């Protein structure tokens, strides 16, 4: 019978640890998030990824193993109260985690940096994205480290809108001679629900309507 404060802290910590575990397991599957619905009857986890087929396994064999591991780690006392479900991301051109994982996977095969960056740029922008930015930092060719930036369109930096309308991720790739950092930023096509949830637009516009004639 612990107090409310400790209950909420416990939920936060469990959320974080589960997310980190799943992000490690499903690296090569475009992992993008987790949702947990804790009932005292059963707890249901809902994974979001791009490649649902190879997440599921052969007749769902892999997802059964994932369920067993998650249960033995977090719900040790009981026996069968947890189940998992996989879902596919509707528009993968606006999920920053997916793009960052794709760039990492490309760069691990030895492909040139510039081609991969222009490719991901062209892929994000054709999904309607209003702006985008990709940054790669480290020993690129020489022994002295460097950064490279690649931009397109329109992007915001300050204020409260920049936290609503922008999607961000960071990843790293272990090359033979060091580590490279990957940093992706996507501004969503004027699509952001509000804190008092409703589809908003932009805190910077004053269109004036045309009189009826």
Partner 1 sequence: LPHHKYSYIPKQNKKLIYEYLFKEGVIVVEKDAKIPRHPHLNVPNLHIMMTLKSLKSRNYVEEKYNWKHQYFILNNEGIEYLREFLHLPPSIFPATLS
Partner 2 sequence: GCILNVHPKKYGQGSRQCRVCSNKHAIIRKYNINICRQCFRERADIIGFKKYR
Partner 3 sequence: RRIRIALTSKNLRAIEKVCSDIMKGAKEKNLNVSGPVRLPVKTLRITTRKSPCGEGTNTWDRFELRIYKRLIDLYSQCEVVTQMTSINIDPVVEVEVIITDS
Partner RNA sequence: GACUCAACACGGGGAAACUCACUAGUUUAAGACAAGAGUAGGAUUGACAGAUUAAUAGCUCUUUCUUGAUUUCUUGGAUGGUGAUGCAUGGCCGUUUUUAGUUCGUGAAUAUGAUUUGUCUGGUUAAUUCCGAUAACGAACGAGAUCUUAACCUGCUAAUUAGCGGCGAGUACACGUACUUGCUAGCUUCUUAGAGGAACAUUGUGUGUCUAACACAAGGAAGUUUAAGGCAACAACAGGUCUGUGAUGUCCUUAGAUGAACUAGGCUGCACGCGUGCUACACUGAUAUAUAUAACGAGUAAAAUAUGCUUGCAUACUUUUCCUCCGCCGAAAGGCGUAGGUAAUCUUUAUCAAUAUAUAUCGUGAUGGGGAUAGAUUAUUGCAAUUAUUAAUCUUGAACGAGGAAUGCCUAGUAAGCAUGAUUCAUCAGAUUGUGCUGACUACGUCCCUGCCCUUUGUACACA
Footprint of partner 2 (CB under 8 A): 5-6, 8-9, 11-13, 15-16, 19
Distance (Å, whole) CA 105 – CA 94: 18
Within positions 167 to 196, which residues make up the interface with partner 3, using CB under 8 A? 195-196
Q: Between 61 and 141, whose beta carbon lies closer to partner 1? A: 61
Please check whether residue 84 is in contact with residue 66, taking contact to mean a CB–CB distance below 8 angstroms: yes
Q: Does 85 bind partner 3 (CB under 8 A)?
A: no
| Partner from partner 2, partner 1, RNA, none binding residue 85, C-beta < 5-8 Å depending on class | none
Six-digit token string for 34? 């987790």
Distance (Å, whole) CA 67 – CA 22: 11
Report how far Cα 185 is from the mean position of its chain's Cα atoms: 11
Q: Does 189 bind RNA (CB under 7 A)?
A: no
Q: How far is the CB of 79 from partner 2 (least distance, A)?
A: 26
Alpha-helical runs (H) found in 26-168: 52-56, 61-74, 96-107, 113-125, 161-164
Q: Which residues bind RNA (CB under 7 A)?
A: 1-6, 137-139, 143-145, 147, 149, 154-162, 170, 172, 174, 177-181, 183, 195-196, 203-204
């Amino acid at each position: 019978p612990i107090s409310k404060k400790r209950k909420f802290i416990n939920d936060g910590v469990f959320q974080a640890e589960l997310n980190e575990f799943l992000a490690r397991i499903l690296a090569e599957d475009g992992y993008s998030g987790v949702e947990v619905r804790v009932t005292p009857i059963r707890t249901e986890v809902i994974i979001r990824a791009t490649r649902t087929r190879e997440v599921l396994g052969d007749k769902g064999r892999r997802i059964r193993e994932l369920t067993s591991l998650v249960q033995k780690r977090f719900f040790n006392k009981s026996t069968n109260s947890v189940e998992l479900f996989a879902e596919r991301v509707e528009h993968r051109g606006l999920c920053a985690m997916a793009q960052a994982e794709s760039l990492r996977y490309k760069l691990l095969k030895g492909l040139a940096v510039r081609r991969a960056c222009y490719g991901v740029l062209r892929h994000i922008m054709e999904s309607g994205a209003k702006g985008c930015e990709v940054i790669v930092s480290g020993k690129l060719r020489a022994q002295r480290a460097k950064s490279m930036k690649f931009r397109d369109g329109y992007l915001i930096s300050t204020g409260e809108p920049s936290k609503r309308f922008v999607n961000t991720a960071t990843r790293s790739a272990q090359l033979k001679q060091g580590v490279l950092g990957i940093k992706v930023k996507i501004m969503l096509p004027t699509a952001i629900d509000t804190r008092t949830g409703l589809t908003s637009i932009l805190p910077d516009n004053i269109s004036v309507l045309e009189p009826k004639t």
